[PDB]
Write an enzyme that holds these catalytic residues in place. Structure first.
Site: not given
Ligand code: HEM
Ligand SMILES: Cc1cc(N)nc(COc2cccc(OCC3CCNCC3)c2)c1
Ligand SMILES: [Cl-]
Ligand code: HEM
Ligand SMILES: Cc1cc(N)nc(COc2cccc(OCC3CCNCC3)c2)c1
Ligand SMILES: C[C@H](O)[C@H](O)[C@H]1CNc2nc(N)[nH]c(=O)c2N1
Ligand SMILES: C[C@H](O)[C@H](O)[C@H]1CNc2nc(N)[nH]c(=O)c2N1
Ligand SMILES: [Cl-]
Lengths: 362, 362
Positions: B237, B68, B65, B242
């Protein structure tokens, strides 16, 4: 122990090299010859065949290289015979000439005598045989910042740069026995440079940007069967992004994105306008267009990625393990538009290979 | 052994959580309380304070993320009290409503009862609470391909999609004791969608592109002090890339780059024209512009990277080790224009955190 390392590496290389060359039956006798030679001299001497294929295997194992598809067509120049700085200089001059090939770049490596017992016969100070100087003094910054330390070292040795943004650094290398390296100015007739223009935007030439045609890495160590070729300059052709997205774009390099935004007629005020992203694209289009117009070899990152996919297939086909550095293989622009981004790579070190070594300056 | 894991994790979490909350002196008594409760019931129950901060710590440890920086302002909704599918549904509905906040998105997590002994109380099938369906049948592909399997599973359960490119998937989750999950159609009044237009190019609307406002991950497991919250949907958000560089650009997603090249009036014939790169930029400019125009929260990747730099500084300032996944932190467009690209990150797993889990479908 050092001898044991040499012999162990020699066994691994000779076996593998001869398998690939179909000279499998000759492994035993060759290894015996080597075993005696190490026992006798503390080292061994490669055949031309082993050396040539070793340098090709080393390119093939370069995890950070996206252009490994053409590993087998590498042009190897054996200069283990050089003894004088005049010979080194002329070899380096010749490398530039033959590799440039009037624009139709030939992937080439010139191999100098290896370390004997950690003792370098020849020590090249240049990072690349062709690179621009860099100057930083009381706020004033000129040229390529990445060359600041080498440039300062060269100006210790009696050389002086004109302080344009594109001073050609001289060749600078040190011979075994000499305390100081010598330096030779490059003949300009050997160096092809490409003026950067844009296909659609006439004002792009107002930036007065240019880059050299051939990237020739000259500070890396080629390791083949326990033998350390610390001086073995190699070159390919540029992938456009190296110039457009890095050398000319990085803040710690030429930092030209703001001026690019200006000439392409867009504002550089808001992050949300993505002006840096737009500037990067037009600048990289300019680089590709310019090299093509001049008939200097270059490849875009999409085509390069396609070729690298073929390399991955070729590797599996031949039963070889693929290794790679994902962080370096992805291009610095639109990486998710390539297959590389969407798969993973084993970043294990396989020998023969090319390695980093300490700078004599700095 | 399972109990021992729980107790060990509980000790690590309670100590660390209470240190940060300045409740250091209360660690001993709280741990004793927990030690008995585990001895007695085979598990323990978090206080609201522990739960709230645990979910915040878990976001802070999310290596992938980039957003963070705002980990401490996470809005935590405690719904461990739910017992019925009506309650789950209304909680999910409420999460969408309050997180959306009429466009001014609130980073929110709704936490449902955790696994007891590996046994899920609630099992959410949705990858995101708001996502588009996908269909693939005899050559014909419609909607989001990434949703193909879940969509097929939903159509097993009596649901039928209209087969537009943007069918809203229903909420689908299974309660403990039920063999089949239930599904509820989303009220459209709860779902904000953003039509994609371009600031300069009028013809961009001819693509008839749109995306939903709020990304709400709903299939990941939140782990806090040995407690497994398999059902804890969270949202932030969007970062523009993305949507613009992935969801709408990937060949295995909406695959819109060729049509983007057409409407922006450039040829999609030559790799050297970098039309994909140009299309990506204009499409990503369109996404950012569209969300801003509608008053739906969004961030560009440059601003996000700046914020992430602050997070890195904040972490060092507070004496916390920074962890991160470089391969995920770099944006898919112009990554070398961010600081993230030019440094490295330790990809160690620190708990509390959010984890992947197996899909009940597929
Ligand atoms: C505040 C706005 C936020 C932005 C702009 C943001 C940005 C991102 C982005 C761009 C990703 C990559 C997603 C992808 O490529 O599919 C990501 C992944 C992630 N974010 Fe955030 N995020 C935000 C809030 C949060 C919140 C609130 C949480 C949880 C409490 C969180 C936890 C995660 C997690 C767990 C992933 C990894 C998901 C995965 O493994 O595919 N984020 N974040
Ligand atoms: C909290 C949050 C914020 C943000 N800006 N964008 C996202 C989008 O995150 C993604 C978007 C696509 C897949 C993903 O991973 C979770 C699954 C779990 C199961 N394996 C495939 C990935 C996480 C989340
Ligand atoms: Cl998405
Ligand atoms: C044929 C044209 C070639 C292309 C397009 C190509 C492409 C690339 C690119 C883009 C890089 C990354 C450079 C950087 O980011 O600084 C790279 C790295 C590298 N290439 Fe190649 N390459 C080519 C030929 C060769 C040859 C002939 C060799 C040696 C025999 C070689 C060995 C390497 C090595 C060792 C690196 C890593 C250097 C480092 O660690 O920084 N490549 N290549
Ligand atoms: C053979 C080749 C082909 C190509 N297209 N581009 C290059 C440029 O490769 C570079 C460009 C810059 C640095 C670098 O790394 C070698 C040094 C060794 C000392 N540490 C810093 C990196 C390698 C080479
Ligand atoms: C194989 C590789 O890890 C994979 O393609 C990753 C790369 N980095 C990523 N980064 C983000 N933000 N999202 C992704 O889905 C991926 N995919
Ligand atoms: C820290 C990180 O490894 C570093 O910035 C790398 C990333 N990937 C790269 N890739 C290439 N081709 N060249 C580089 O100099 C770098 N730098
Ligand atoms: Cl270079």
């Amino acid at each position: 122990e050092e001898k044991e390392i040499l012999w162990n590496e020699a066994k691994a290389f000779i076996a593998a090299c001869y398998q690939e060359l179909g000279k499998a039956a000759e492994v035993k006798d060759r290894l015996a010859d080597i075993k005696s030679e190490i026992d006798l001299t503390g080292s061994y001497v490669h055949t031309k065949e082993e050396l040539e294929h070793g340098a090709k295997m080393a390119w093939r194992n370069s995890n950070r290289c996206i252009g490994r598809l053409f590993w087998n067509s590498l042009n190897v120049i054996d200069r283990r015979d050089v003894r004088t700085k005049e010979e080194v200089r002329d070899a380096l001059f010749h490398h530039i000439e033959t590799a440039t090939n009037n624009g139709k770049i030939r992937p080439t490596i010139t191999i100098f005598p290896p370390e004997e017992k950690g003792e370098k016969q020849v020590e090249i100070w240049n990072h690349q045989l062709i690179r621009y100087a860099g100057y930083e003094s009381d706020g004033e910054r000129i040229g390529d910042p990445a060359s600041c330390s080498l440039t300062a070292a060269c100006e210790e040795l009696g050389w002086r740069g004109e302080r344009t943004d594109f001073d050609l650094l001289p060749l600078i290398f040190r011979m075994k026995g000499d305390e100081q390296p010598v330096w030779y100015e490059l003949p300009r007739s050997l160096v092809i440079e490409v003026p950067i223009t844009h296909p659609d935007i006439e004002a792009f030439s107002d930036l007065e940007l240019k880059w050299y045609g051939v990237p020739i890495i000259s500070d890396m160590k080629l390791e083949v069967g326990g033998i350390h070729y610390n001086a073995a300059p190699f070159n390919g052709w540029y992938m456009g992004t190296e110039i457009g997205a890095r050398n000319l774009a990085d803040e710690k390099r030429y930092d030209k994105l703001k001026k690019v935004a200006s000439v392409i007629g867009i504002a550089a005020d808001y992050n949300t306008d993505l002006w840096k992203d737009q500037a990067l694209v037009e600048l990289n289009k300019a680089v590709l267009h310019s090299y093509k117009k001049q008939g200097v070899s270059i490849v875009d990152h999409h085509t390069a990625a396609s070729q690298f996919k073929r390399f991955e297939e070729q590797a599996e086909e031949a039963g070889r393990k693929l290794t790679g550095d994902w962080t370096w293989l992805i291009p610095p622009i639109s990486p998710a538009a390539t297959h590389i981004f969407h798969r993973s790579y084993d970043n294990s070190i396989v020998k023969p290979n090319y390695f980093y070594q300490d700078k004599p300056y700095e």
